[PDB]
Inverse folding.
RNA sequence: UUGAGCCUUGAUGUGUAGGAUAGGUGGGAGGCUUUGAAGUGUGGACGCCAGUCUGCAUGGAGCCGACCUUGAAAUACCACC
């Protein structure tokens, strides 16, 4: 279950703490500490009834340095999440892609949908923790 | 004593693919691993009783998912769950 590596990375930072977005882009480098090149994803929990097709969320936004583009679509449960780029990019380069996807996520709220949009959104890498960001 | 709600988290569901009791989206060719390891074993749990899960030493440092066969994943792993 628990290995020699996930003791460090899952607990080097506190995933239960809501970090700032400006702090998050530098702390994901610790979460992306690996031999290969990972990809950081923003995980947004949306409680829509995705079986009702009128509440579906779908779109894509722009990346300023290619890959290139980023595409997002929800599952059949309602949780919608996608990447923002590679982790070899600079923290200020992942600054640009994170808010552009986030604002377009706020733009695509359905008319009949209700409730609070963001609860515990997390920057999730390929193998790092789901660090709580706001 | 007995209901209801909360958390870092252990497990959780063969028609048919197939080694396998896959519920999905998200990620990439790396994890697991000399931070004590594969397979056995059993207290206990285990089902649609085809067969599996939790703790470890005597054991002793090895095991895996591409593609392909599939309506689709074939947990090595992480994350939302």
């Amino acid at each position: 279950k628990l290995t020699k590596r996930m003791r460090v990375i899952r607990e080097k930072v506190d995933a239960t703490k809501q970090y700032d977005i400006n702090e998050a882009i530098a702390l994901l480098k610790e979460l992306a500490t690996a031999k290969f090149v990972e990809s950081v994803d923003v995980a947004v929990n949306l409680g829509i009834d995705a079986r009702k097709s009128d509440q579906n969320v779908r779109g894509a936004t722009v990346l300023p340095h290619g890959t290139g583009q980023v595409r997002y679509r929800n599952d059949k449960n309602g949780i919608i999440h996608t990447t923002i780029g590679k982790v070899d990019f600079d923290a200020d380069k992942l600054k640009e892609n994170l808010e552009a996807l986030l604002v377009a996520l706020k733009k695509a709220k359905p008319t009949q949908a209700k409730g609070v949009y963001i609860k515990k959104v997390s920057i999730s890498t390929t193998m790092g923790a789901g660090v709580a960001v706001d």
Notes: Residues 1, 3-7, 9-10, 15-16, 34-41, 43-45, 72-77, 79-83, 120, 122, 124-130 of chain A lie near RNA strand B (CB under 10 Å from a C1'). Residues 50 and 56 of chain A are 6 Å apart (CA to CA). Helices of chain A lie at 6-12, 21-31, 91-107.
